[PDB]
Amino acid sequence: GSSGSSGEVSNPSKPGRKTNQLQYMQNVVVKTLWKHQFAWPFYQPVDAIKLNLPDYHKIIKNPMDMGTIKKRLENNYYWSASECMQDFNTMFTNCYIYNKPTDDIVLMAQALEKIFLQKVAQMPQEEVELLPPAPKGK
């Protein structure tokens, strides 16, 4: 399969359900990285048409951005937070490949990544199912 995609947001073939580990990712890790002063260029995927990058996918092996990481956490794409961690790694790494090591977007990714590592370091190492939600009332 040739390159031409930005990943997916749900998956029926891959196993997955809502867990405490994925909850910590979407409730504290993503939550704090999204509140950051440099979160804004990661809120959406790179539109190579709008950015005028005719070679974007020639350098980028695996395009990944925070706006797509949260969109699979909002679903049952996976079972464990180690997959969300590898997506965060893939976002920061693909940014470092394409750009100069002194460009603003690299310094932004370096400042987000240090917080990401401090946050997942405080995530549990064991995994558990969540409690059931409250009922609707509309």
Asked if residue 27 lies in contact with residue 124, where contact means CB atoms within 8 angstroms, the answer is: no
Experimental method: NMR
What is the C-alpha to C-alpha distance for residues 133 and 31, in angstroms, rounded to an integer? Answer: 20
Question: Amino acid identity of 128?
Answer: V
Residue 25's identity, in one-letter code, is M
Dist CA 30 CA 25 (whole Å): 6
Q: Rounded to an integer, what distance in angstroms lies between the CA atom of residue 46 and that of residue 43?
A: 10
- What lies within 8 Å, CB to CB, of 128 at 6+ separation is 19, 20, 21
- Structural tokens at position 128: 């558990």
Residue type, 65: D
* Domain limits, the chain: 1-138
Query: Distance (Å, rounded) from C-alpha 37 to C-alpha 28?
Result: 16
Sorted by sequence, the CB contacts under 8 Å of residue 100 that are 6+ apart come out as 106
CATH number of 1-138: 2.60.40.10, 1.20.920.10, 2.60.120.380, 3.40.190.10? 1.20.920.10
- For residue 96 the two structure tokens come to 């470092």
Sorted by sequence, the CB contacts under 8 Å of residue 52 that are 6+ apart come out as none
